[PDB]
Structure 1
Amino acid sequence: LLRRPGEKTYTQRCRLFVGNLPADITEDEFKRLFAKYGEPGEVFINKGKGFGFIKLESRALAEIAKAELDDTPMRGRQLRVRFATHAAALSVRNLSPYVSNELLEEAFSQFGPIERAVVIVDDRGRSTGKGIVEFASKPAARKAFERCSEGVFLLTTTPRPVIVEPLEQLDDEDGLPEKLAQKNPMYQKERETPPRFAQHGTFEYEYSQRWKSLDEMEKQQREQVEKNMKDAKDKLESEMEDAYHEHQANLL
């Protein structure tokens, strides 16, 4: 806590979700659970449903608390500690490859207080044309979402409207454990045949080979649509440049 971790502290990236809390949990007890991770930020406890949230000062402190407190006992119950899913986050796409984390953040700060913006890069450190914008409040995210949908928001010279969408937040951490899968009645009949390579001549081999052929055809039709629409977007660009005499002087 001596030196600031950066520009913003106690952000939603610093928020932890804590599940399986005992029924008699108190705010003091919950705060004491996190006492070694510095001064607590906002605390929200759902005593009736056994869960709470806490904001720590930095992402590193939340990472340590999560690693140290996850799956530890509290009065006969194993606490479940996880990063709280971001409640005020947006997906952005159609970005120029020359938009940086800082340009995206500066650009989106006009909609309200911003925590972070990032341009998603591939293994080479090159822009994928997609990014993430994390706001300090849900209204700021709603306004960014509405305004960029209704208007044309441009970040650089080349006119590329930023396309703002809800951020897909899927669980690739816990997934579907065997404990829940077992609760299904058709599960027993499903696990009856072990993983295998289907063999030539069998119905399952023939069905699977035809299925794969349809999937390959679907991939080819999807890639074609992309190409077809890439050409319509290039033709639109050319017609509009001519309509607006983009390379030429003209009074009207």
Structure 2
Amino acid sequence: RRPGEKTYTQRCRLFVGNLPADITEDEFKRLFAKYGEPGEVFINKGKGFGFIKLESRALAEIAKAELDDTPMRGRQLRVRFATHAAALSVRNLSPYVSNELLEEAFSQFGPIERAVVIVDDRGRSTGKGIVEFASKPAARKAFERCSEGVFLLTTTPRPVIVEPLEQLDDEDGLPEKLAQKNPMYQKERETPPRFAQHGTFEYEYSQRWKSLDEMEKQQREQVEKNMKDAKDKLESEMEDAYHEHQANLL
């Protein structure tokens, strides 16, 4: 199932639209009793969507795999993982913080479902991660306490920067269905995809845009280096003020 629990958490919350108009609290359940003893359930039968919690991420995965785009009284089904409600980004992490540590530190704010540290295709800490709370109230606190205060995790004072999680969708995307529903759209369609030939407006334009784009890049990278350099110096600055005062008392 899932050893050492993390049962019936928001990561086991699935969503389902395109419910036919004749649906009960009970028929829903009957649809997902294959995958065991359900948790919190919600339906707005009016608007033909519903939510369900399963015991485990795995069950939720299988359910989803099994019940997506399958019929129920004419209607094909929309199974999706539900977007977590109590989720923060964290940044400025010591390369030496672990998923475990980050979870540990954050529990001081209320029960945690999960906490992860985002890693590169080389598995190196990217310096960001996610913290996922059970409830929202805990996430409120976290985000407040940490904006108001200075939360540190390791010896070297790296202050945690905590933001609300921005949630992107890269699975559904922008389907044609929804696209067409726009005026500018049909105009934008009229001229197909293409490489633009030297000689045309399109050309001299985009070559120039490209340049502006390249510039912006350098500009941005330049800023990052400045402020990088600033940040390293500030180390070498404060030292004097304080560290030296601890070599005077000693």
Mapping for residues 102-141 of structure 1, pairs under 5 Å: 102-141=100-139
- 2:149 and 2:244 map into 1 onto residues whose CA distance is 22
Q: Shift of the alpha carbon at 1:248?
A: 4.7
Residue 144 of structure 1: which of 136, 142, 149 is its match? Answer: 142
- Residue-by-residue CA offset, 1:31-56 (whole Å, 9 max, x unaligned): 11101011101101112211111010
- 1:247 and 1:14 map into 2 onto residues whose CA distance is 53
Q: Shift of the alpha carbon at 1:197?
A: 0.8
SS of residue in 2 equivalent to 1:90: strand
Q: Shift of the alpha carbon at 1:246?
A: 5.6
- 2:210 and 2:2 map into 1 onto residues whose CA distance is 54
Mapping for residues 1-252 of structure 1, pairs under 5 Å: 4-245=2-243, 248-251=246-249
Report runs of 4+ in structure 1 exceeding 2 Å deviation: 3-7
Q: Shift of the alpha carbon at 1:123?
A: 0.5
- Residue-by-residue CA offset, 1:81-105 (whole Å, 9 max, x unaligned): 0000010011001001110110000
Q: Shift of the alpha carbon at 1:247?
A: 8.7
- Residue-by-residue CA offset, 1:110-168 (whole Å, 9 max, x unaligned): 10000000000001111000000000000011111101111111111111001000111
Query: Which shows bigger deviation, 234-243 or 212-221?
Result: 234-243
Q: CA RMSD in A?
A: 1.4
CA, structure 1 residues 221+92, in 2 after alignment: closer, same or farther (shift >3 Å)?
Answer: same
Unaligned runs of 5+ in 2: none
CA, structure 1 residues 28+217, in 2 after alignment: closer, same or farther (shift >3 Å)?
Answer: same
Q: Shift of the alpha carbon at 1:184?
A: 1.4
CA, structure 1 residues 101+247, in 2 after alignment: closer, same or farther (shift >3 Å)?
Answer: farther
Unaligned runs of 5+ in 1: none
- 1:9 and 1:27 map into 2 onto residues whose CA distance is 22
- 2:179 and 2:212 map into 1 onto residues whose CA distance is 29
- 2:244 and 2:58 map into 1 onto residues whose CA distance is 50
Q: Shift of the alpha carbon at 1:57?
A: 0.3
Q: Shift of the alpha carbon at 1:201?
A: 1.3
- 1:178 and 1:95 map into 2 onto residues whose CA distance is 40
- Residue-by-residue CA offset, 1:152-189 (whole Å, 9 max, x unaligned): 11111111001000111011010011111112122221
Q: Shift of the alpha carbon at 1:7?
A: 3.0
Q: Shift of the alpha carbon at 1:202?
A: 1.0
- Percent of matched pairs sharing the same residue: 100
- 2:136 and 2:178 map into 1 onto residues whose CA distance is 33
CA contact (8 A) 1:5 1:58 kept: no
Q: Shift of the alpha carbon at 1:4?
A: 3.9
- 2:225 and 2:184 map into 1 onto residues whose CA distance is 42
